[PDB]
């Protein structure tokens with residue numbers, strides 16, 4: 026719109042292009058997402074009221090000339106760029122633990138309001154100079170291609186997934202921060218499923234009741250044995266490995282909720298360290 030001066034392209038998701046921009050009427054720098062179904066307008070208005078320290082604030086919604094723009098608060102850097110900048114030494118454990126803890130508080134808040142993210146990835150986790158991290162793009166999937174973070178139930182064709190899909194994605198991110206390598210970098214839906222099966226074991230009715238009756242399950246899937254987590258995420262300690270194994274349970278009903286994960290022994294010594302970032 027005319028009240029906004031675009032400074033540059035921040036990025037672009039499936040739902041649209043994002044720009045860093047200046048709001049001439051306030052002078053504030055903002056993240057402007059250019060995306061209209063009445064249903065959408067409604068759902069979005071709801072997201073506007075959801076306020077929490079670990080969620081990127083939706084400042085305003087501009088439905089104009091039959092176009093839809095979302096104006097969000099701007100946050101200094103994304104987690105992916107910080108991970109790449111830290112690949113030689115890795116992110117310090119105390120910061121990994123602070124970031125996971127905060128992300129769980131945000132997810133717990135969202136989940137209590139029945140809002141799922143559905144597409145968590147490093148690119149949409151934003152960090153500031155003060156040690157905080159925030160979830161961006163939450164609620165949009167509902168409102169309106171890396172498969173690395175997708176829960177198995179989505180890959181198997183389940184249409185009514187729950188809050189548990191977000192815990193799965195967070196577990197994959199947790200592992201990636203620790204080892205500095207993506208946990209399941211599949212390049213197609215089937216390759217993704219198979220990379221998951223090769224590490225966690227092909228699922229069956231014992232570990233996942235109902236799995237064989239999922240829309241895309243095939244009796245012909247290969248049968249791989251489960252690997253030990255000590256091999257998958259060294260040097261994560263045993264408390265960290267136990268929390269991770271619970272976030273990665275195959276059955277969505279057995280997967281740990283964001284709320285219960287906040288009381289896990291892993292977080293007993295959390296602190297809030299300030300990162301070493303270059304903007």
Ligand SMILES: O=C(Nc1ccccn1)Nc1cccc2c1[C@H]1CCCN1C2=O
Pocket residue numbers: 035036037038043056058081097098099100101102103148149151161162
């Ligand atoms: O504030 C932001 N900063 C930033 C910095 C570097 C890279 C990306 N973003 N970004 C920001 C803020 C609100 C919403 C969105 C974003 C970007 C991140 C990926 C997709 N986008 C969104 O939908």
